[PDB]
Design a binder for this molecule. Structure first.
Ligand SMILES: NC(=O)c1ccc[n+]([C@@H]2O[C@H](COP(=O)([O-])OP(=O)(O)OC[C@H]3O[C@@H](n4cnc5c(N)ncnc54)[C@H](OP(=O)(O)O)[C@@H]3O)[C@@H](O)[C@H]2O)c1
Ligand SMILES: NC(=O)c1ccc[n+]([C@@H]2O[C@H](COP(=O)([O-])OP(=O)(O)OC[C@H]3O[C@@H](n4cnc5c(N)ncnc54)[C@H](OP(=O)(O)O)[C@@H]3O)[C@@H](O)[C@H]2O)c1
Lengths: 248, 248
């Protein structure tokens, strides 16, 4: 039984991989940097010798690539799929680089939608299955200077909240959940603004570590809650139901 | 001075083109079916002899096509861009047709985001410009059996509400607006479910006509409101401010 974690080379996906290794889970770890995926596999084997770890060096910003990824796991028993890979951008809309933003849409929205749709197709009536889509507090509240990225997370939040309630009302075995972190200490900011060195310790007054966010993600999987969300002011993690209007 | 209307060959965009014709505006009408674009241009000339009417047969579900559409309009003075083209689907997520849904994402989301970003880049500091993106009441309220489509509209609403407030806070000249129709008598249901003949008169107990929704769109352009939205319970058209949380 496997747990698929996209965006496993760094940040939340990376630490989630390590936390799930400590539970004896076997992993499919997806990202582009093979080097880091291999060093993580080495950590995972010393944490948990009997875990199986499959690596997949895949750019998920290409729709065909995402299809290929999934059909290549057809002969695996996947209990959890975690749509964690995603990128950010800080800039006024009038200043954006469309090539980067277009790529952001293909990763944040499409890849996640392809994998969620395919997982749901084959796993809705299968006992013990979980889908966890990583949104953001930015997917429930709009943040200045990050309009485009926030809107990808609004998509993710609304899509997962509607998929979750679809599967509940239909009596599915598959459970779908959304994680909405707040500021979490990872590479995300450095990628988003395009230059390294951003220091959360010095520049952000409240943030979780990547390990703390792996821990929240794991508790979300271990709950009957659809939404795991960090409060923007208290930075308490809350497991709760949907935030948006449901017309049902 | 031109008003660009994507999705002009039927429905809201078609009736919007005719309304703006009666005000003497010149139009750039974008859709795939040349046939109907020429039929509308004939109507526009009969309403408005002196209106200029450029037609563009373009599939906007291709990102390159959307760039090409815009770069080809750079010789023109565009006062208004209306991202109206969009497509729906009624289906459990487990039952969708990915090729249809992936095309829906490229049109409902990407096309609109390319055209809005490029319009915003060249027109933010230009007096009298207006960007109007068409979302839906299902972009503020999740509707069963249309999870994926509603999420494209949550993207549109959140993107445009965030862009609108970005332009206000930064003193732009450009105004950005979002329209959120409810049931509107168009080809939209027929295209979404794949089969013709859906009858609003017999099947839907409250709905607006396409001409009424073009009127609401024109009301929204002529206001300081960021949002023009049909209330699901009263079916009154409301001009109001943003609905989502703004962190600034
Ligand atoms: N950090 C925060 O404050 C925060 C808050 C809310 C939500 N989030 C969300 O958290 C998730 C993880 O981000 P993070 O904070 O952990 O940042 P991160 O450390 O930069 O991790 C992003 C991950 O995505 C992978 N990735 C990026 N582009 C990819 C592509 N085209 N194909 C495949 N994999 C790709 C990266 O590895 P490769 O580059 O090697 O592929 C990396 O593993 C994202 O959904 C992000 O939006 C972050
Ligand atoms: N009708 C409703 O109840 C309702 C409610 C809320 C929001 N909306 C929104 O209203 C907008 C307009 O839809 P409508 O109700 O007027 O429906 P419609 O009659 O089906 O018109 C849709 C328009 O989109 C164009 N279009 C579709 N795919 C395209 C593509 N790939 N490239 C270029 N143009 C394309 C169509 O023309 P071609 O096929 O010729 O390209 C047509 O002009 C959509 O954004 C829809 O989501 C509708």
């Amino acid at each position: 039984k496997y747990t698929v974690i996209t965006g496993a080379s760094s940040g939340i996906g990376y630490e989630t991989a390590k936390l799930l290794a400590g539970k004896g889970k076997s992993l499919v770890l997806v990202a582009r940097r093979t080097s880091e995926l291999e060093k993580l596999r080495d950590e995972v084997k010393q944490i948990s010798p009997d875990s199986d770890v499959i690596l997949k060096s895949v750019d998920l910003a290409d729709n065909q690539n995402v299809h290929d990824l999934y059909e290549g796991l057809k002969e695996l028993d996947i209990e959890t799929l975690i749509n964690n890979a995603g990128v950010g951008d800080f800039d006024l809309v009038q200043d954006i680089e469309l090539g980067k933003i277009e790529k952001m849409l293909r990763l944040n929205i499409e890849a996640l939608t392809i994998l969620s749709s395919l997982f749901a197709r084959d796993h809705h009536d299968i006992e013990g299955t979980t889908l966890v889509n990583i949104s953001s507090l930015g997917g429930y509240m709009i943040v200045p200077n990050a309009v485009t990225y926030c809107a990808t997370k609004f998509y993710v939040s609304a899509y997962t909240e509607g998929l979750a309630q679809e599967l509940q009302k239909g009596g599915a075995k598959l459970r779908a959940k959304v994680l909405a972190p707040a500021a979490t200490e990872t590479e995300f900011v450095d990628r988003a603004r395009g230059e390294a060195g951003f220091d959360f310790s010095k520049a952000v007054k409240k943030y979780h570590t990547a390990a703390e966010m792996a821990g929240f993600l794991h508790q979300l999987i271990e709950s009957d809650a659809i939404v795991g969300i960090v409060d923007g002011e208290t930075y308490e993690f809350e497991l709760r139901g949907p935030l948006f209007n449901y017309a049902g």
